[PDB]
Amino acid sequence: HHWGYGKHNGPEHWHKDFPIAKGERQSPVDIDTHTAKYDPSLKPLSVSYDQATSLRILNNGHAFNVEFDDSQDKAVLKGGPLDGTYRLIQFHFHWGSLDGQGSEHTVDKKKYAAELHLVHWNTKYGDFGKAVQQPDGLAILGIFLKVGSAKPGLQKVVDVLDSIKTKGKSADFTNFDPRGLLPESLDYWTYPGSLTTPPLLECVTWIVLKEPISVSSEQVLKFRKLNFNGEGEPEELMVDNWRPAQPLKNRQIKASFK
Numbered sequence: 001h002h003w004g005y006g007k008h009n010g011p012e013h014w015h016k017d018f019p020i021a022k023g024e025r026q027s028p029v030d031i032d033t034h035t036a037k038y039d040p041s042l043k044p045l046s047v048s049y050d051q052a053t054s055l056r057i058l059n060n061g062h063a064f065n066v067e068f069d070d071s072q073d074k075a076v077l078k079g080g081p082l083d084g085t086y087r088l089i090q091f092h093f094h095w096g097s098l099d100g101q102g103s104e105h106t107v108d109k110k111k112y113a114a115e116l117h118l119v120h121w122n123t124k125y126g127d128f129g130k131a132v133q134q135p136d137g138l139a140i141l142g143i144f145l146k147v148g149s150a151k152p153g154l155q156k157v158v159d160v161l162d163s164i165k166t167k168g169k170s171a172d173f174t175n176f177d178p179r180g181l182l183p184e185s186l187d188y189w190t191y192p193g194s195l196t197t198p199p200l201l202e203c204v205t206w207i208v209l210k211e212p213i214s215v216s217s218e219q220v221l222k223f224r225k226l227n228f229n230g231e232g233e234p235e236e237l238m239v240d241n242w243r244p245a246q247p248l249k250n251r252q253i254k255a256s257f258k
């Protein structure tokens with residue numbers, strides 16, 4: 001596969017190799033705050049990251065992933081809309097070439113500068129690869145980024161990016177605390193959907209936080225210096241690595257807050 005975000009292999013082409021791209025439960029979506037309904041049945045959401053063990057950061061040619069040890073319940077997501085326990089495996093971002101675009105989800109059609117995805121898999125399925133084959137296999141916590149003040153908790157990520165500039169490079173990345181990427185409020189919207197990159201599997205309970213985090217223009221500018229290409233290949237800046245909103249179809253977006 002040669003999917004990407006370029007001029008000839010971007011999101012509008014993915015359906016040829018991944019027909020589920022035109023499926024019933026695709027992500028991202030636009031969140032219409034005028035039709036999402038408060039759901040008093042959501043249970044409290046629970047982010048337990050005190051024992052998280054980051055290991056490594058990888059440029060995979062599509063984004064970079066900060067990877068965690070997921071062989072024990074060290075960093076888990078529970079509550080909210082979820083049944084059971086979901087273990088953190090990685091986080092990554094999607095971002096724009098311009099501050100006015102970059103997010104995958106939109107809010108009343110507003111695009112944020114970027115979007116953080118903390119990816120968790122349902123421990124009842126034993127491993128990530130089995131989990132993605134199940135409709136309730138993953139829980140992805142999505143957090144919007146706007147450009148303003150710097151996010152101090154992001155700076156250690158920013159400062160390692162020079163070491164993983166190109167596709168296939170990785171670097172040790174231990175002792176990173178993902179709590180430093182959360183906003184104050186855990187109010188959220190939730191709906192059933194998909195991975196936003198191929199294979200686009202419809203295995204995700206999405207939990208999108210209402211409150212964005214702020215990052216500085218200097219922080220996003222360093223993301224925009226990453227490369228989609230490998231070392232030695234023509235330079236292609238890693239920007240605009242977002243899929244646009246997909247049809248909601250027979251889904252409802254539910255709000256945790258009034």
Ligand SMILES: [Zn+2]
Binds near residue numbers: 093196
């Ligand atoms: Zn993502």
